[PDB]
Amino acid sequence: NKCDVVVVGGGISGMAAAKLLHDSGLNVVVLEARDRVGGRTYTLRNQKVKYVDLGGSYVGPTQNRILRLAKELGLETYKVNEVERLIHHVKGKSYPFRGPFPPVWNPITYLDHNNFWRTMDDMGREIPSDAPWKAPLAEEWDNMTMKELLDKLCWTESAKQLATLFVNLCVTAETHEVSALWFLWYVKQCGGTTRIISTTNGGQERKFVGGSGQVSERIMDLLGDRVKLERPVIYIDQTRENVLVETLNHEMYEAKYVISAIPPTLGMKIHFNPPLPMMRNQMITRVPLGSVIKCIVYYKEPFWRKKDYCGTMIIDGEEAPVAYTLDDTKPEGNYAAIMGFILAHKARKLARLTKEERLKKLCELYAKVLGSLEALEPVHYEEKNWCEEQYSGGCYTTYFPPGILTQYGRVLRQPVDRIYFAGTETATHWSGYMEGAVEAGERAAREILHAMGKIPEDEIWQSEPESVDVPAQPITTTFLERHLPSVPGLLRLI
Amino acid sequence: NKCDVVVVGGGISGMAAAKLLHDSGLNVVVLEARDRVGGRTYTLRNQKVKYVDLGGSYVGPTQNRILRLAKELGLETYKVNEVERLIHHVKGKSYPFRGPFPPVWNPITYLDHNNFWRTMDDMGREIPSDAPWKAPLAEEWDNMTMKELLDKLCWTESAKQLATLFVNLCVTAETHEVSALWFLWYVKQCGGTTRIISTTNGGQERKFVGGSGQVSERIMDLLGDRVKLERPVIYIDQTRENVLVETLNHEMYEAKYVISAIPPTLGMKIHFNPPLPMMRNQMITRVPLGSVIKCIVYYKEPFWRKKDYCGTMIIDGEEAPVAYTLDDTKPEGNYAAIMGFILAHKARKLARLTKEERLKKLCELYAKVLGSLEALEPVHYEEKNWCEEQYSGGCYTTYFPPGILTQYGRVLRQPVDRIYFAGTETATHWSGYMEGAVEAGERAAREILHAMGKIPEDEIWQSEPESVDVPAQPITTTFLERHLPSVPGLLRLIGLTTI
Ligand SMILES: *Cc1cc2c(cc1C)nc1c(=O)[nH]c(=O)nc-1n2C[C@H](O)[C@H](O)[C@H](O)COP(=O)(O)OP(=O)(O)OC[C@H]1O[C@@H](n2cnc3c(N)ncnc32)[C@H](O)[C@@H]1O
Ligand SMILES: *Cc1cc2c(cc1C)nc1c(=O)[nH]c(=O)nc-1n2C[C@H](O)[C@H](O)[C@H](O)COP(=O)(O)OP(=O)(O)OC[C@H]1O[C@@H](n2cnc3c(N)ncnc32)[C@H](O)[C@@H]1O
Ligand SMILES: O=C1Nc2ccccc2C1=O
Ligand SMILES: O=C1Nc2ccccc2C1=O
């Protein structure tokens, strides 16, 4: 029944919000639709895998909030294996390489690739993290898709194909599905192209020992019976003195404030009284989540290491079910595994297959790319198709189709009377990630503390000290990378 | 509690479905979220206006299902005024014209305009009405916005600007918001560019005497207490022998089958057990409705007629709040009024204003376009911003952003166990319209009749006899319209003569 704040959703964002409010002495209730916490994180345990992250997994430098929260809850990280060579598989052939970026040898192609990434970061510098619609060319960039931008910028097919893979991997969506403004914001707010795409010194550097699901689980442990599982919220009524929140299983909660910690579009599953303001009413129909199947194939040994491959594969082309992999072997060297993503349209295309059929396709692909018959001998397989989840809508996160961010972006985290908005989609740094979930949950909690007159306005948004365990190395460029001409630039010199 | 079929939604589609099922002898219940039926149709009555359609209003030739349904319910139509000259207002000046379309005099610009509409219809012919994802270039066309297509096809700004207005008006969305495949399908499934855009011989030919809301109201009258108002559906459970449908006001309905007669995305307001299959689960997050404020300014007299203007204004330019108007005067010649739409981004931009502020902007615009100080003297004003409606999501209808129709379109009307899908969005002819609502509601009802073994499979989709009251003239082209070159075609010809 009665409390200070009802938090809708027990993912990392809702849990982080509820923990902050609880720690500040307020009575909080978390209403969670599923029979588990964690949301877009989910750690499965069984004897064959020990544990495996089937949802969000990776953390890395500059993600100081999730690192701090997890540390406080008693979690540790380990490094994703990147000791040996990465592979870029293109036109049916594997090209091993060292460093974060696949080498390009044709000189014109080199200029084209160099210019593309440079231009993405250059454009990002004009986009405010907290207000992408305030970019000088916001409308121009929002009114084109990433496909149109790539078509404009890439003078080579090589660059266009790799840029396409990059978009598909970062946002689990096709280049033609997403706004260029939104995508450029998305990369910039993760620290740029190098930071978002890198394992060492980037977003994929580390995983949590025992799984990321432990973040939400351990906060649920702290909160005890304040977390109500299998309580999908169906109705929020703000017409009276206290806010009334009703669940599907016919319970009523009464609170001073509510935090909505669910993906924006999942606000549609709640009937509002009074109705939402027009802009939010339409916004929540305009913001889908991406499409992905996360697939983990287990082997007797991390056999790829013997061939001086780390397990990272960047696989171009329509035929390959999986465009990107990482080594998912445990820090101890056992439960050898390759994690791969079936991205965007391929998640839709291949969802029809059986689990065994997807396993066979992945093993055959890996055998080709790793040049090893050992890939054909899996000992176990786990997968999760996030497209099927009623209470997620997809993964990793919400994307904005052309025209939406400039028209509706302003209302994403605008309070609606006594409802405040958390969820990783409302973050300004690593929005889309567990890091963003923490930022947004804690910010939304502090908005309520401010509304209650408990903290001053300047304490709503709080900086985070850098992790001592996961220090960030700066991203650097060389003189040549900065100054080499684009393809049209070299043509203009002729 | 118990019935044969629960229909979710009491708009025209749900009402048409319920009526067909009721007439066939089944026990139906309609669960309607609002305190009224009609949905995206809404006829306001007061003394100042008598009646006015604030939602869907127009019907026309080839929309034979809505015409037949409305006729059976005792309704009559009248013709929208198009006697006098139309106006095209471009770059701050009005150019009156007759016949359907603004004349283009510049031979280059004329070639460009001619080619644009022709190409739209040419492309449409490649798109199956019942399966647009089967078009030979479906992926190519679905992966670009209408903005990209216009940028490719229009060699003049004049054609691009008019094409933009056309898209904004047809689908209450910006050219950069919508898939080219979906928009080309949308126009084709209305009979093409001429049919969709025309008043005389087109979609906007007529209105119902007394308002379109009467369609849903009169079916409610027939169904009696089978229509349950203020019953928003929150939960559908298909795990047991009979389907269970729960409403927000804590009632449970049990049925053999369900028809979902709501906009596809509003399916999100329902919690499903078991969960929807993956494709539908994601589809219903990918399909927004457009944005529009329908505004009606009333005057003492239809003064524009005295200046030989019918009241139709096609108004280009960012500054104009309204891009399109029609005379909304009653057939008797009283309650003189101009209907205008505030479209797409402008509905968002101008929603912040007060009603009085929007009225002032509209009157000042109309005074300019009509060259008439009388437009500054309104006697009354009504408006409805459909973007604010929890149980519509927008108007007129659902649009598909780039990439969606090819990836998810197949599941739009695919049954989910014992849930069948109605709603105008699932129609194959005039989807988006009252006509499409009738087609889809009746088709969904007949899918259930087939499931019950009451009718054979070939009776699910049923042709409609042409209206005797609203005959359709064929859409024709001239030899020159067919064969005149595009601008690049002309340039190719010039280059060949030069070489
Ligand atoms: C799915 C996915 C995500 C992902 C990823 C790979 C996959 C396959 N890779 C990641 C990575 O390696 N590193 C990283 O930081 N994140 C990556 N992600 C994304 C990450 O998982 C998400 O950004 C993060 O988990 C989102 O957290 P947030 O708390 O903002 O949102 P949520 O997890 O979706 O939680 C929402 C909760 O709300 C419940 N819910 C939904 N509707 C209701 C209603 N109506 N009532 C009550 N509860 C509701 C959901 O069940 C969920 O628990
Ligand atoms: C809004 C609009 C529409 C419109 C138009 C101008 C405007 C401003 N111009 C039109 C025109 O002149 N000619 C024409 O034929 N149509 C034009 N339209 C479009 C037209 O209004 C629609 O195509 C048609 O009315 C759609 O009918 P349909 O029956 O398919 O859908 P609906 O009217 O939206 O009805 C849905 C009903 O379902 C109820 N609902 C919604 N959610 C729930 C839940 N969860 N539970 C129970 N009921 C629910 C809605 O309240 C609604 O009544
Ligand atoms: O899980 C992941 N999320 C990502 C986002 C960008 C690049 C790689 C990855 C992953 O491996
Ligand atoms: O109401 C309307 N719907 C339309 C669709 C296309 C063109 C004109 C109109 C109207 O006037």
Q: Distance between CA A68 and CA A75 in Å, rounded?
A: 10
Does residue A315 sit in the same domain as residue A364? Answer: yes
Residue A204 and residue A332 in one domain = yes
Burial class (CB in 10 A: 0-12, 13-18, 19+), A151: middle
Characterize the bridge pairing of strands B257-260 and B324-327. unpaired
Residues A431 and B12: their CA atoms lie apart, in Å, by 42
Q: Scan for tokens 């650097």, then name that residue.
A: A476
Chain A residues 412-471 with CB within 8 Å of chain B: none
Q: Determine the 3-state secondary structure of A487 from DSSP.
A: helix
Q: Are B133 and B406 in contact (CB under 8 A)?
A: yes
If you take atom 11 of ligand 3, which residue's CA is the nearest one? A204
Interface check B248 vs A, CB under 8 A: yes
Resolution in A: 1.7
Q: How far is Cα B6 from Cα B355, in angstroms, rounded to an integer?
A: 39
Min Cα distance A129 → chain B (Å) is 23
- The residues, any chain, with a CB within 8 Å of residue B408's CB and separated by 6 or more, are A348, B279, B282, B283, B286, B287
Minimal C-alpha gap between A472 and chain B (Å): 37
Instruction: Report yes or no on A232 lying in a domain.
Output: yes
Rounded CA-CA distance B194/A323 in Å is 46
CATH of the domain at A337: 3.90.660.10
Buried b (16+ CB within 10 A) or exposed e, A75-114: bebeebbbebbbbbbbeeebebeeebbbebeeeebbbbbb
Tokens of B350: 């101008």
C-alpha B179/C-alpha B288 separation (Å) is: 12
Number of folded domains in chain A?
A: 3
Is omega for the bond preceding A102 within 30 degrees of 0, making it cis?
A: no
Contact A58 CB / ligand 3 (< 6 Å): yes
| Residues A394 and B282: beta-carbon distance below 8 Å | yes
Give the number of the atom of ligand 2 that is nearest the alpha carbon of residue B36: 53
**CB–CB of B345 and A407 under 8 A?**
yes
Between the CA of A399 and the centroid of ligand 4 the distance, in Å, is 31
Mapped onto helix, strand or coil, the DSSP state of residue B313 is strand
Collapse the DSSP code of A338 into the 3-class scheme (helix H, G, I; strand E, B; otherwise coil) and give the result: strand
Alpha-carbon B86 to chain mean position: 22
Is B467 part of a structural domain of the chain? no
The 10 Å Cβ neighbour count of residue A20 is: 21
Q: Name the domain boundary from A365, A380, A400.
A: A400
Is residue B420 domain-resident?
Answer: yes
Amino acid at B491: L
A331 shares its domain with A204: yes
Please tell me whether residues B352 and B375 are part of one structural domain. Answer: yes
In sign, the C-alpha dihedral spanning B123, B124, B128, B133 is positive
Q: Cβ separation of A389 and B271 shorter than 8 Å?
A: no
Q: Are residue A81 and residue A165 in the same domain, yes or no?
A: no
Residue A474: inside a domain = no
Cα–Cα distance measured from residue A393 to residue A346, given in angstroms and rounded to the nearest whole number: 17
**Phi and psi of A106, rounded to 5°?**
-60, 130
Pick the residue from chain A with its C-alpha nearest to B284.
A285
Distance CA B428, CA B450 (A): 19
Distance of CA A1 to the CA centre of its chain: 34
Task: Give backbone dihedrals phi and psi of A94, rounded to 5 degrees, phi first.
Answer: -95, 135
Instruction: With CB atoms and an 8 Å threshold, state whether A385 touches B278.
Output: yes
Q: Find chain B residues with C-beta within 8 A of A278's C-beta.
A: 348, 351, 385, 387-388
- A330 falls within a domain: yes
Interval between CA B342 and ligand 4 midpoint (Å): 12
Burial (CB count within 10 angstroms: exposed 0-12, middle 13-18, buried 19+), residue A373: exposed
The CA R_g of chain B, rounded to the nearest whole Å, is 23
Q: How far is CA B226 from CA A140, B9, B223, B242, in A?
A: 51, 12, 6, 19
- Say whether B143 and A174 touch across the interface (CB within 8 A): yes
Task: Flag whether B255 is in a domain.
Answer: yes
Asked whether residue A344 falls in the same domain as residue A382, the answer is yes
Nearest CA-CA distance, residue A391 and chain B, Å: 9
Residue B292 buriedness (CB in 10 A; 0-12 / 13-18 / 19+): buried
Atom number in ligand 3 closest to CA A324: 11
Same domain (yes/no): A355, A396: yes
Containing domain of residue A330, as a range? 40-60+77-105+198-208+288-400
**CB-based contact A403:A182 (threshold 8 Å):** no
DSSP per-residue string spanning A219-285: HHHHHGGGEEES--EEEEE-SSSSEEEEETTS-EEEESEEEE-S-GGGGGGSEEESPPPHHHHHHTT
Residue A440 CA to its chain's centroid (Å): 14
Residue of B270, B387, B407 lying closest to A278 (CB–CB): B387
CATH number at residue A415: 3.50.50.60
Give the distance, in angstroms, between the CA of residue B152 and the centroid of all CA atoms in the same chain.
26
Sign of the CA dihedral A441, A442, A444, A449?
A: positive
Nearest to A485 by CA among A102, A68, A113: A113
What CA–CA distance (Å, rounded) separates B200 from A39?
55
Whether the upstream peptide bond of residue B366 has omega within 30° of 0, thus cis, is no
A390 and A351 belong to one structural domain? yes
Four-CA torsion A121, A122, A128, A132, nearest 10 degrees = -80
Index of the ligand 1 atom closest to the CA of residue A294: 8
Per the listing, tokens 């993290």 go with A129
Half-sphere exposure for A481 (CA within 13 Å, toward CB) = 11
> Given the DSSP bridges, would you call strands A257-260 and B85-90 parallel, antiparallel or unpaired?
unpaired
Question: Is B491 part of a structural domain of the chain?
Answer: no
Nearest ligand to the CA of B56 is 2
Q: Name the residue type at position A30.
A: V
A128 touches chain B (CB under 8 A): no
Residue type, B201: N
Strand ordering across the sheet containing A252-255? A252-255, A243-247, A233-237, A271-273
How many other CB atoms sit within 10 Å of the CB of residue A44?
17
- Cα–Cα distance between A480 and A117 in angstroms, integer? 13
CB < 8 Å from A in window 255-314 of B: 265-266, 268-272, 275-279, 281-282, 285-289, 291
The CA-atom distances, in angstroms, between A269 and each of A392, A489, B237 are 11, 51, 15
Residues 6+ positions from A304 with CB-CB distance below 8 Å:
A84, A310, A311, A327, A338, A370, A372
A473 part of a folded domain: no
Contact of A271 with A235, CB cutoff 8 Å: yes
Return d(Cα B320, Cα B297) in angstroms, integer.
15
Q: Does B129 touch chain A (CB under 8 A)?
A: no
CA–CA gap between residue A235 and residue A255 (Å, rounded): 13
| Contact at CB, B407 and A275, closer than 8 angstroms | no
Same domain (yes/no): B274, B408? yes
Q: Which helix (H) or strand (E) holds A7?
A: strand A5-8
| Same domain? A166 vs A202 | no
C-alpha dist (Å) from residue A383 to A63, A295, A357, B76: 26, 4, 12, 59
**Ligand 4 — pocket residues by CB below 6 A?**
B 58, 169-170, 196-197, 203-204, 326
- Do A272 and A409 share a domain, yes or no? yes
- A328 and A352 assigned to the same domain: yes
**DSSP 3-state assignment of B323?**
coil
H helices of B430-486, in order, are 434-451, 479-483
* End-of-domain residue from the set A167, A197, A227: A197
C-alpha to C-alpha distances, A261 to A9, A172, A429, B15, nearest whole angstrom:
5, 21, 17, 37
Ligand nearest to the CA of A167: 3
End position of a domain, from candidates B347, B379, B400: B400
Q: Where are the alpha helices (DSSP H) in A300-403?
A: 345-350, 355-370
